[PDB]
Amino acid sequence: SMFLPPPECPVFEPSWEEFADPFAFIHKIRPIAEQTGICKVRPPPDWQPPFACDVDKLHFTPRIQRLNELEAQTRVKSDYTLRTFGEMADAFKSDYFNMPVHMVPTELVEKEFWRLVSTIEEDVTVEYGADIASKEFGSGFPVRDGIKLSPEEEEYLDSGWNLNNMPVMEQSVLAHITADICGMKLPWLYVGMCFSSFCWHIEDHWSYSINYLHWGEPKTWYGVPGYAAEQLENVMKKLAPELFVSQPDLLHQLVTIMNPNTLMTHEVPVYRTNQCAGEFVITFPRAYHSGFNQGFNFAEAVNFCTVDWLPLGRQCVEHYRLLHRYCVFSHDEMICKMASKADVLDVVVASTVQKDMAIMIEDEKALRETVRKLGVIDSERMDFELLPDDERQCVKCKTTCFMSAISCSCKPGLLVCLHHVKELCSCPPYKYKLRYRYTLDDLYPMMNALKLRAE
Binding residues for Zn ion, per CB under 5 A?
Answer: 394, 396-397, 417, 419-420
Beta-carbon contacts of residue 78 (< 8 Å; ≥ 6 apart): 61, 62
Q: Tell me whether residue 336 or residue 394 sits nearer to Zn ion (CB atom).
A: 394
- Examine residue 198 and tell whether it contacts ligand P60 (CB under 6 A): yes
Cα gap 334→322, rounded to integer Å = 21
Beta-carbon contacts of residue 199 (< 8 Å; ≥ 6 apart): 73, 75, 255, 256, 257, 290
For the stretch 361-371, what's the b/e string if a residue is b when 16 or more beta carbons lie within 10 angstroms of its beta carbon?
beebeebbeeb
- Examine residue 29 and tell whether it contacts ligand P60 (CB under 6 A): no
**Position 359: which residue type?**
I
C-alpha distance across the termini of the chain, in Å: 59
- HSE-up of 169 (CA within 13 Å, CB side)? 20
Q: Tell me whether residue 122 or residue 152 sits nearer to Cl ion (CB atom).
A: 122
Strands (E), 314-388: 378-381
- Examine residue 254 and tell whether it contacts ligand P60 (CB under 6 A): no
CB 411, min distance to Zn ion, A: 15
- Residue 224 binds which of Cl ion, ligand P60, Zn ion, none (CB < 5-8 A, kind-dependent): none
- Residue 130 binds which of Cl ion, ligand P60, Zn ion, none (CB < 5-8 A, kind-dependent): ligand P60
139 is known to lie in a ligand binding site = no
- Residue 397 binds which of Zn ion, ligand P60, Cl ion, none (CB < 5-8 A, kind-dependent): Zn ion
Q: Which of 57, 61, 92, 93 is nearest to 76 (CA)?
A: 61
> Where is 129: in which H helix or E strand?
strand 125-132
Beta-carbon contacts of residue 372 (< 8 Å; ≥ 6 apart): none
341 is known to lie in a ligand binding site = no
Phi then psi dihedrals of residue 262, to 5 deg? -60, -40
Q: Tell me whether residue 69 or residue 153 sits nearer to Cl ion (CB atom).
A: 69
Q: Tell me whether residue 122 or residue 362 sits nearer to Cl ion (CB atom).
A: 122
Q: Tell me whether residue 128 or residue 212 sits nearer to Cl ion (CB atom).
A: 128
Cβ distance 348 to 310 under 8 Å?
A: no
- Examine residue 250 and tell whether it contacts ligand P60 (CB under 6 A): no
Q: Tell me whether residue 28 or residue 75 sits nearer to ligand P60 (CB atom).
A: 75
288 is known to lie in a ligand binding site = no
Q: Which of helix, strand or coil describes residue 322?
A: helix
297 is known to lie in a ligand binding site = no
Q: Which of helix, strand or coil describes residue 281?
A: strand
Q: Tell me whether residue 126 or residue 417 sits nearer to Cl ion (CB atom).
A: 126
Pick from 20, 76, 116, 254 the residue near ligand P60 by CB under 6 A: 76
CB 332, min distance to Zn ion, A: 13
CB 365, min distance to ligand P60, A: 36
Phi then psi dihedrals of residue 303, to 5 deg? -85, 155
- Residue 205 binds which of Cl ion, ligand P60, Zn ion, none (CB < 5-8 A, kind-dependent): none
Fill in the per-residue mask, 203 to 232: x = in contact with ligand P60 (CB under 6 A), - = not in contact.
x-----x-----------------------
CB 242, min distance to Cl ion, A: 17
Strands (E), 256-319: 271-275, 280-283, 289-293, 297-304
Q: Inter-axis angle of helices 310-322 and 331-339, to 10 degrees?
A: 150
> Where is 28: in which H helix or E strand?
helix 22-33
CB 216, min distance to ligand P60, A: 15
289 is known to lie in a ligand binding site = yes
- Residue 122 binds which of ligand P60, Cl ion, Zn ion, none (CB < 5-8 A, kind-dependent): Cl ion
If you count them, how many residues does the chain have? 455
- Residue 420 binds which of Zn ion, ligand P60, Cl ion, none (CB < 5-8 A, kind-dependent): Zn ion
Cβ distance 277 to 216 under 8 Å?
A: yes
Query: In the beta sheet, which residues pair with residue 87?
Result: none
Q: Tell me whether residue 194 or residue 339 sits nearer to ligand P60 (CB atom).
A: 194
Q: Tell me whether residue 112 or residue 363 sits nearer to Cl ion (CB atom).
A: 112
Cα gap 215→254, rounded to integer Å = 30
Q: Which of 67, 41, 66, 293 is nearest to 191 (CA)?
A: 293
- Chain position whose Cβ is nearest to Zn ion: 394
- Examine residue 188 and tell whether it contacts ligand P60 (CB under 6 A): yes
209 is known to lie in a ligand binding site = yes
219 is known to lie in a ligand binding site = yes
Fill in the per-residue mask, 289 to 318: x = in contact with ligand P60 (CB under 6 A), - = not in contact.
x-----------------------------
Pick from 41, 126, 130, 376 the residue near ligand P60 by CB under 6 A: 130
Query: Footprint of Cl ion on this chain (CB under 5 A)?
Result: 68, 122
Chain breaks after residues in the chain, where C lies over 2.5 Å from next N: 77
Q: Which residues lie near ligand P60 (CB under 6 A)?
A: 76, 130, 188, 198, 203, 209, 289
Binding residues for 2-oxoglutarate: 128, 209, 211, 219
Binding residues for Fe cation: 201, 203, 289
